[PDB]
């Protein structure tokens, strides 16, 4: 028995990706960014992913590796094999710069030069195609598959003229064909003469950017339930001669018994059912009523919590990210971990082409897979956004540790040119004139009076930052630290402060043995800093629910959640949301 599934249908927020599995082995195609988030919400059976097949060197195709290697490291999968362009493995020697030279997992890379494979089923054949190089994969069970990627119009003529597909067209039998091509090039005129020759008995699956659907379900559920409390700070999310069907979430297929689709576990959203389920929790409705009665008691500088999790994400909190915007047309992103662009898109919708046009700089605290992975996704999409608005490309300033430049240089030299979108400021120069003038540009582009940095605790070369505006409001971002005096010394009297509750109280021994902070320690550090408001972020990977309360939870403390919005005028009412939230996650 063998099936097939569509992990991602190719929406704007997530690239295309396919998942094949049987009794013996399991496979994966185009492991793009955010793929590891999926396959865990849906509870798909990993633990046997011997092979990964990649159709291009672009980031949207190869972005999910760094997380999938670690996921396989968990559960101890002995080996994995990559297949794709010859430029692989040089991408991989670049990942080891920041991912740490892990030796528990041994892996191999197969270039396009290997034609046969032939291992225990389905006998992958690799088919290189040039325009500048893509590889198409066709598989033959001991039925047949076809998986093709056609990013541009220039690939149509090579694709339709290849001789490899001609011994399966007409009469072999190719059960399916999967296309991942933009809607613009899907029709052409030379095209549709190639997918025709397979005969109408075959069905074609397409994963264009027009594949509108929701791949998460649970995030939307929790967000609507939260919006039940107070809508302003919890906005709702937003998303031929032969037969042809458009791709959806997972879906399903069968090849041997009969070639039939199956909607066994498609995902659907039912806001009203979510609301009625929510209203049955113990004392949730009463708490919301009390809060609404209590509510009877500027908006420009605001912060959006795109991500608040730690370690590999777990379907409720994504890897840490936080957007700070000083005006409707000037912004700043802070940490840029994995999945940032997906969160931004699923938060704003069609305004992303304008929000990306306001970014002025980014700030990565340190080099961990949860803090800098998603930057190239922001850069590439910012390029397109600038193109759509009819303005030239202006490099996006980035403040980062000096060790980040090595990974970017390796990627630039080995996979694709991405370095020309970036202007780098070494974070060391912003703590206690070529880079000085770039610093002046950073300060002037946001009207910030000063930008400050400090070497915080945790691993080597980890930093925090403080931002102070000409209007006088001051916000300090800690990053990952254990209670240290670098904060406070960085400048007290901050209007807002963000700190990490990576652990619950009573685990100070773990907070000492490993460099992370408990909630009580975080609140203590914030109160010593004498900040007007204290905000908790970067939560523990164990629970992902509301934290544990302690006596020191003063009026100045708050609990951050994913996709949440905040303004300086919301502080007097923010502490009053605790009861209904605690009733929600009972």
Q: Which residues bind Zn ion (CB under 5 A)?
A: 368, 480
d(CA 464, CA 34): 26
Nearer to Zn ion, 367 or 425 (CB): 367
* Distances 555 to 502, 524, 528, 532, 579 between C-alpha atoms, Å: 21, 13, 15, 10, 13
Q: Could you say which DSSP state residue 105 is in?
A: S
Nearer to Zn ion, 14 or 340 (CB): 340
Q: Encoding tokens for residue 130?
A: 């040039």
* Least distance from Zn ion to the Cβ atom of residue 517, Å: 11
Torsion sign, CA atoms 493, 499, 501, 505? negative
Nearer to Zn ion, 28 or 321 (CB): 321
* Least distance from Zn ion to the Cβ atom of residue 480, Å: 4
* Least distance from Zn ion to the Cβ atom of residue 369, Å: 8
* Least distance from Zn ion to the Cβ atom of residue 308, Å: 11
* Least distance from Zn ion to the Cβ atom of residue 400, Å: 14
Nearer to Zn ion, 110 or 368 (CB): 368
Tell me the residue nearest to Zn ion as measured from the CB: 368
* Distances 360 to 72, 256, 326, 379, 398 between C-alpha atoms, Å: 37, 54, 11, 12, 9
* Least distance from Zn ion to the Cβ atom of residue 5, Å: 32
- Alpha helices (H) in 192-251, listed in sequence order: 218-227
Nearer to Zn ion, 249 or 367 (CB): 367
* Distances 69 to 47, 65, 202, 318, 319 between C-alpha atoms, Å: 11, 6, 35, 18, 17
Nearer to Zn ion, 56 or 458 (CB): 458
119-141 exposure pattern, b = at least 16 Cβ within 10 A, e = fewer: eebbebbbbbbeeeebbbbbbbe
d(CA 530, CA 532): 6
Closest listed residue to residue 312, CA positions, set 30, 59, 542, 548: 542
* Least distance from Zn ion to the Cβ atom of residue 311, Å: 8
Nearer to Zn ion, 203 or 481 (CB): 481
Measured in whole angstroms, the distance separating CA 297 from the mean position of its chain's CA atoms is: 39
Bridge partners, 474 (sequence order): 468
Nearer to Zn ion, 368 or 372 (CB): 368
Nearer to Zn ion, 33 or 480 (CB): 480
* Least distance from Zn ion to the Cβ atom of residue 371, Å: 6
Q: Encoding tokens for residue 48?
A: 């046997």
Q: Taking each helix axis as running N to C, give the angle between helix 340-348 and helix 375-388, from 0 to 180 degrees, rounded to the nearest 10.
A: 40
Residue appearing with tokens 């997380």: 67
* Least distance from Zn ion to the Cβ atom of residue 375, Å: 15
């Amino acid at each position: 028995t063998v099936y097939l599934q569509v992990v991602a249908a190719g929406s704007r927020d997530s690239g295309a990706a396919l998942y094949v599995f049987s009794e013996f082995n399991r496979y994966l195609f185009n492991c793009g960014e955010g793929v590891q988030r999926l396959m865990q919400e849906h509870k798909l059976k990993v633990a046997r992913l011997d092979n990964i097949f990649l159709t291009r060197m672009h980031w949207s195709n190869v972005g999910g590796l760094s997380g999938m290697i670690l996921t396989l490291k968990e559960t101890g999968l002995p080996k994995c094999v990559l297949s794709g362009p010859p430029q692989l493995e040089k991408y991989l020697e670049a990942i080891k710069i920041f991912s740490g030279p892990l030796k528990g997992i041994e892996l191999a890379v197969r270039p396009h030069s290997a034609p046969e494979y032939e291992d225990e089923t389905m006998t992958v054949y690799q088919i290189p195609i040039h325009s500048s190089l893509v590889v198409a994969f066709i598989c033959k069970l001991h039925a047949a598959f076809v998986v093709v990627e056609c990013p541009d119009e220039s690939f149509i003529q090579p694709i339709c003229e290849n001789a490899t597909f001609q011994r399966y067209q007409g009469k072999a039998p190719v059960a399916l064909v999967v296309h991942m091509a933009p809607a613009s090039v899907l029709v052409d005129s030379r095209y549709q003469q190639w997918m025709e020759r397979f005969g109408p008995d075959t069905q074609h699956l397409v994963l264009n950017e027009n594949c509108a659907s929701v791949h998460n379900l649970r995030s939307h559920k929790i967000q609507t339930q939260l919006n039940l409390i107070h809508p302003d700070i919890f906005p709702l999310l937003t998303s031929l001669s032969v037969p042809m069907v458009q791709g959806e979430c997972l879906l399903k297929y069968q090849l041997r018994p009969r070639r039939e689709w199956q909607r066994d576990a498609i995902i659907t959203c039912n806001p009203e059912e979510f609301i009625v389920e929510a209203l049955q929790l113990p004392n949730f409705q009463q708490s919301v009523q009390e809060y609404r009665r209590s509510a009877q008691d500027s908006q420009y500088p605001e912060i959006i919590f795109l991500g608040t999790g730690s370690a590999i994400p777990m379907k409720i909190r994504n890897v840490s990210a936080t957007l700070v915007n000083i005006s409707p047309d000037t912004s700043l992103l802070l940490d840029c971990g994995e999945g940032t662009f997906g969160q931004l898109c699923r938060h704003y919708g069609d305004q992303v082409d304008r929000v990306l046009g306001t970014l002025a700089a980014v700030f990565v605290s340190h080099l961990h897979a949860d803090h800098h992975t998603g930057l190239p996704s922001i850069l590439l999409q910012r390029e397109r956004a600038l193109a759509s608005l009819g303005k030239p490309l202006h490099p996006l300033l980035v403040v980062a540790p000096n060790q980040l430049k090595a990974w970017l240089q390796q990627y630039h030299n080995q996979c694709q040119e991405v370095l020309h979108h970036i202007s780098m400021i070494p974070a060391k120069c912003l703590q206690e004139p070529a880079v000085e003038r770039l610093i002046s540009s950073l300060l002037r582009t946001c009207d910030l009076e000063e930008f400050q940095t400090c070497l915080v605790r945790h691993c080597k070369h980890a930093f925090g930052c403080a931002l102070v505006h000409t209007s006088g409001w001051k916000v300090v971002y800690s990053g990952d630290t254990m209670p240290c005096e670098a904060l406070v010394r960085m400048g007290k009297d901050a209007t807002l402060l963000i700190h990490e509750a990576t652990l619950e109280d009573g685990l100070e021994e773990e907070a000492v043995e490993k460099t992370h902070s408990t909630t009580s320690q975080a609140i203590s550090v914030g109160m010593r800093m004498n900040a007007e408001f204290i905000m908790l972020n970067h939560f523990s990977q164990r629970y992902a629910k509301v934290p544990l309360f302690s006596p020191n939870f003063s009026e100045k403390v708050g609990v951050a959640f994913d996709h949440m919005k905040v303004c300086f005028g919301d502080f007097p009412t923010m502490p009053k949301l605790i009861p209904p939230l605690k009733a929600l996650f009972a």
